[PDB]
């Protein structure tokens, strides 16, 4: 018999992105080649099958630094991290291949789906 | 020029509630009289003006235990904590006064609004 506030989930995510922008309560740095990205482990796990696996691991759960595979493109990661915190994906002709490869590695199935559909339309 | 995934914010919140249920990465206990509630500080701040103020404080941000005012009803808090993590509010005749008082203390304006509207309809 609950009532539901339609905008609540969006409002929560907006405030989680505000916390990320202000670097409040961030508990991990994701290292992608020469670049570093601060984030909240809980948000990363909620969005990515890869981070969900990493941070449920009894040893990796306590690491303050995670290094991604050297093949991972920093811009692709940046675009996906922005998506995690906003629901918005900056998908462009010049970045689609890097975004799809990063989304496959991060196990973000909905992003992979759409990248596949956008590539298929251009061929 | 971003595209947006409609269900992303809801999916994030569902996974944050799964983390809470499994007690993964919870970093605070909220004490309400004889009862204890584990939660994630980031979610509490994202939902509540009171917790936003508490956890931006340079000393309180590091506390693992927060004690609420003894006038706060544990069931009212439980209902509001469930709402924070799900967007669903279990508002009933028998709990509405406790829910509204807890929502006022926690500075959860949308919940206060609706409690006011539901009480006005019954008078």
């Amino acid at each position: 018999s609950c009532i539901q506030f339609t905008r609540h989930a969006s409002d929560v995510l907006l405030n989680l992105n505000r916390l990320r922008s202000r670097d409040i309560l961030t508990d991990v740095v994701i290292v992608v080649s020469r670049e570093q990205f601060r984030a909240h482990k809980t948000v990363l796990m909620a969005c990515s099958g890869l981070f969900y696996s990493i941070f449920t691991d009894q040893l990796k759960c306590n690491l303050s630094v995670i290094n991604l595979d050297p093949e991972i493109n920093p811009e692709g990661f940046c675009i996906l991290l922005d998506f995690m915190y906003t629901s918005r994906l900056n998908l462009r002709e010049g970045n689609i291949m890097a975004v799809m490869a990063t989304a496959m590695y991060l196990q973000m199935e909905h992003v992979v789906d759409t990248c596949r559909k956008f590539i298929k339309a251009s061929e | 020029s971003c595209i947006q995934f409609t269900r992303h914010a809801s999916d994030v919140l569902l996974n944050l509630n799964r983390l809470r249920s499994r007690d993964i990465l919870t970093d605070v206990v909220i004490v309400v009289s004889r009862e204890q509630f584990r939660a994630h500080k980031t979610v509490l701040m994202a939902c509540s003006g009171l917790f936003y103020s508490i956890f931006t404080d340079q000393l309180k941000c590091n506390l693992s235990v927060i004690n609420l005012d003894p006038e706060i009803n544990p069931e009212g808090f439980c209902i509001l904590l469930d709402f924070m993590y799900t967007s669903r509010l279990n508002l009933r005749e028998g709990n509405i006064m406790a829910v509204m008082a807890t929502a006022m203390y926690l500075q959860m304006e949308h919940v206060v609004d609706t409690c006011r509207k539901f009480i006005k309809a019954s008078e």
Partner: peptide, 4 residues
């Protein structure tokens, strides 16, 4: 607010 809605009836979900």
């Amino acid at each position: 607010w809605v009836i979900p």
